[PDB]
């Protein structure tokens, strides 16, 4: 299947309390593998997955130096945007950036991207061509003109198509045992009563990797994604994920409803009923 390398960056000002908080968090697919946090006692880039021990001291030194550099540019960005939007110095503001590339199973580039947000709203984004930017408002239009006259798109393009891709391949190789494994879901169904002769049935899926999964409830072969409550697939603290999906049914008619689990580690999808 496809793989991705992504870096989540956040800068958050806190007037009266010192310098903005700056964080970088990197993921290979759905696994966190590196992080930087300015509020650590000794802010360094750190490994978050066991396989990253295969990198030497120079790797960590370089990443740390980048992060400290990036930190400062975002402190300046925060000030700049107060000007663009005519905002006072007394309020907290957030800049978020997502950058990444994705490859097929053969290691070839599928797509690269970089998008910025200010206070939780779209600011500026690299287009799918990797040559031009698109700007959500006139503040970001100023940024767009700056980056065009500087030719920034071209440098970023070279990173996404070259560096990002090659290091992603390297990580998938070094972390093979972890990143290309498949842990199969284990499922079960729970039962909860309700006021008016009705019952909640909840289908759980546990211990699976990768995160992509599909849970559905069925009555008479038709999928019931109408009255289905759901949580987003969520990390379980050990490298695996879990999910649940629930449906409200008539009391005494529980046996006519089936849960279906689809996962790449399930050659044939699971089918479960509620068992007394």
């Amino acid at each position: 299947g496809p793989h991705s390398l992504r870096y989540f960056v956040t800068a958050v000002s806190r007037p009266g309390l010192g310098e903005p908080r700056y964080m970088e968090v990197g993921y290979v697919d759905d696994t966190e593998f590196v992080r930087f946090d300015s509020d650590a006692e000794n802010p360094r880039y750190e490994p978050r997955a066991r396989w990253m021990e295969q990198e030497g001291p120079e790797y960590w030194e370089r990443e740390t130096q980048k992060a400290k550099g990036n930190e400062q540019s975002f402190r300046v960005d925060l000030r700049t945007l107060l000007g663009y939007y005519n905002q006072s110095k007394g309020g907290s503001h957030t800049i978020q950036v997502i950058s990444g590339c994705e490859v097929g199973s053969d290691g070839r580039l599928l797509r690269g991207y970089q998008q910025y947000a200010y206070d939780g709203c779209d600011y500026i984004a690299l287009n799918e061509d990797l040559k031009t930017w698109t700007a959500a408002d006139m503040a970001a239009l100023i940024t767009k003109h700056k980056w065009e006259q500087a030719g920034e798109a071209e440098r970023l393009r070279a990173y996404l198509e070259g560096t990002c891709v090659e290091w992603l391949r390297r990580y998938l190789k070094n972390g093979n045992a972890t990143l290309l494994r498949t842990d199969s879901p284990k499922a079960h169904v729970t039962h909860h009563s309700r006021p008016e002769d009705k019952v909640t049935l909840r289908c759980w899926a546990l211990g699976f990797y990768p995160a992509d999964i599909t849970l559905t409830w069925q009555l008479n072969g038709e999928e019931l994604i109408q009255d289905m409550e759901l949580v987003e697939t969520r990390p379980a603290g050990d490298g695996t994920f879990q999910k649940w999906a629930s449906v409200v049914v008539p009391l005494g008619k529980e046996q006519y409803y089936t849960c279906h689990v689809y996962h790449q580690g399930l050659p044939e999808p699971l089918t479960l009923r509620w068992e007394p």
């Binding site: 990197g26 992060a67 700049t80 700056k146 500087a150 560096t163 990002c164």
Partner: peptide
């Protein structure tokens, strides 16, 4: 290998 430059806004 993280991006080493985020140009200023």
């Amino acid at each position: 290998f993280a991006p080493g430059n985020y140009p200023a806004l």
